[PDB]
Amino acid sequence: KRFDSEKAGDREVQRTMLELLNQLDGFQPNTQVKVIAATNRVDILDPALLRSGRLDRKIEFPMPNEEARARIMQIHSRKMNVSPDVNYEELARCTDDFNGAQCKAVCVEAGMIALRRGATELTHEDYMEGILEVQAKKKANLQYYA
Amino acid sequence: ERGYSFSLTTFSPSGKLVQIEYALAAVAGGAPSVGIKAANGVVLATEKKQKSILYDERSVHKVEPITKHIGLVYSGMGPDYRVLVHRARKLAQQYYLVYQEPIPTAQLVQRVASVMQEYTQSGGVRPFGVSLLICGWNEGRPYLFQSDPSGAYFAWKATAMGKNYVNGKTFLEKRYNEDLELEDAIHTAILTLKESFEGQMTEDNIEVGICNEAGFRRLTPTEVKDYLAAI
């Protein structure tokens, strides 16, 4: 976001941004170049990026809800030898506030736990121990509950 | 409700109250005013500059009376002025209910100063942003006091307040002296308000309230109209 500030670090970036905006849309329009932009925050971007031909569509990417999470683990475990008594809905129900990368890290961690005990095909408890590692829960001492 | 009840006016490490100085700087960017006590009565003058000709000048007022012999003008913020005017009126009525005598101006000044002090000290509220100028002819001798937003008060023969007040103070020290009359005090108050006013000076711009031994009187536009000519 361009504002009133000091130094030369921001002013060089704003110089390159104003070069980017004119060469993308405005004088000499071009069809033959298609631009794709990605970010993780949008509150920082300048409103001149949300103009006519700069950024045409604004696309959301929410966190996976239930069936997307069961779909992710099915895709990543395609190469792995999986024992055919595992139901992914129970995993997707237990795994909460995850993403695509975290559900990917569950499958890789589960396959190693079978390698630690040397078993080839997986099991349900291989996945659950992968779940407990991914959550990264610190030492608790929470034995004064319930 | 919330009920903060914590005081947010605290001492600086240099040993001063920063909010009091900020309120005094708010006062110094206010409307100009002058007050002259000269040997028969007190004259208070100020400036009403509207941003447009569509305003009604006679609707709101700035030389607001309190009793039949006590007057008040201000320099600062307008919304923070009607509140202490109403408080001073109610307090003077309580004094008249108890003691059955018109309230002397000095006691009014100490009690509004104590009100300003307890607004500074108490919890969850900001200090006031208005310097007062209280005039009155009680027991023969005229009185003119000024109370700052710190909650203190002084006594002045002739003082000025608001924007460009140090040169007005030098004007009042140089041109005026110890003994005047009422009419030439009105003349020099109009002059020292004219030292920082606009090109025109009519009764629609300036507002003058005088006091004497016959009671407090806010001047009509006719009296200020013929006073503003050739002065």
């Binding site: - | 903060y4 309120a23 305003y55 009604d56 307008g78 009607r82």
Partner: protein, 240 residues
């Protein structure tokens, strides 16, 4: 040029200004509407455009022309919820005055009570300063029509003709030139000036279904809200 908590709570800046009322003014022109009040010789008129962007929305409950008392009318600008809270507070204070002091409350005293209520909001540091505007019209015997405008900062003042909302500067710039030649300000002249002010500021030539006009006068002191037939008549009389 802040002092840590200068942005958030209502306190004095080092420059002397208190910033929360200045950030609350933007709530008046955030809403996107403009309202003009014009006072003449024997009438006071209020004109406000209304926005109905969806056909399923009821068009009879959009109007900001609120009724305070049977001879005292008002209009709003800014956030609608704070405007309705001020409407209910003004109705309660008018009824309280009519119960207490026996006679009908004048317009300026109601505006003083509203301003004194709004001053405590900027005095203390625990409440939002309630960013909505106030325009009141009425008739007072041996004073004629009266029009007043209060403020979220608590500053009330009398007026001859004024506007509030988003387009205050251009409307006042046109209105000063309109009022500078003091002509015969009758009823038709006042409604023509009030309509043409918004017609020249916005340059839209509005249909009669999107303009609300409130009237008060000396011939009858009752507050009236003009229906579409008289707005039709005034708009076809305006077009020569």
């Amino acid at each position: 040029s802040s002092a840590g908590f200068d942005r958030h709570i209502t306190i004095f800046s080092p420059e002397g200004r208190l910033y929360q009322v200045e950030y609350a003014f933007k709530a008046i022109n955030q809403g996107g509407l403009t309202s003009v009040a014009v006072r003449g010789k024997d009438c006071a008129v209020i004109v406000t455009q209304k926005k109905v962007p969806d056909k399923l929305l009821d068009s009879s409950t959009v109007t900001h022309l609120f009724k305070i008392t049977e001879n005292i009318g008002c209009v709003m600008t800014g956030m609608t919820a704070d405007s309705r809270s001020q409407v209910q507070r003004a109705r309660y204070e008018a009824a309280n005055w009519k119960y207490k002091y026996g006679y009908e409350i004048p317009v300026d005293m109601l505006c003083k009570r509203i301003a004194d209520i709004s001053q405590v909001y900027t005095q203390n540091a625990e409440m939002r300063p309630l960013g909505c505007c106030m325009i009141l019209i009425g008739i007072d015997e041996e004073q004629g029509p009266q029009v007043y405008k209060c403020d979220p900062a608590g500053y009330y003042c009398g007026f001859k003709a004024t506007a509030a909302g988003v387009k205050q500067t251009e409307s006042t710039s046109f209105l000063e030139k309109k009022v500078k030649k003091k002509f015969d300000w009758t009823f038709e002249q006042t409604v023509e000036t009030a309509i043409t002010c918004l017609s020249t500021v916005l340059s839209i030539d509005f249909k009669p279904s999107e303009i609300e006009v409130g009237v008060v006068t000396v011939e009858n002191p009752k507050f009236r809200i003009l229906t579409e037939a008289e707005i039709d008549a005034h708009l076809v009389a305006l077009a020569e």
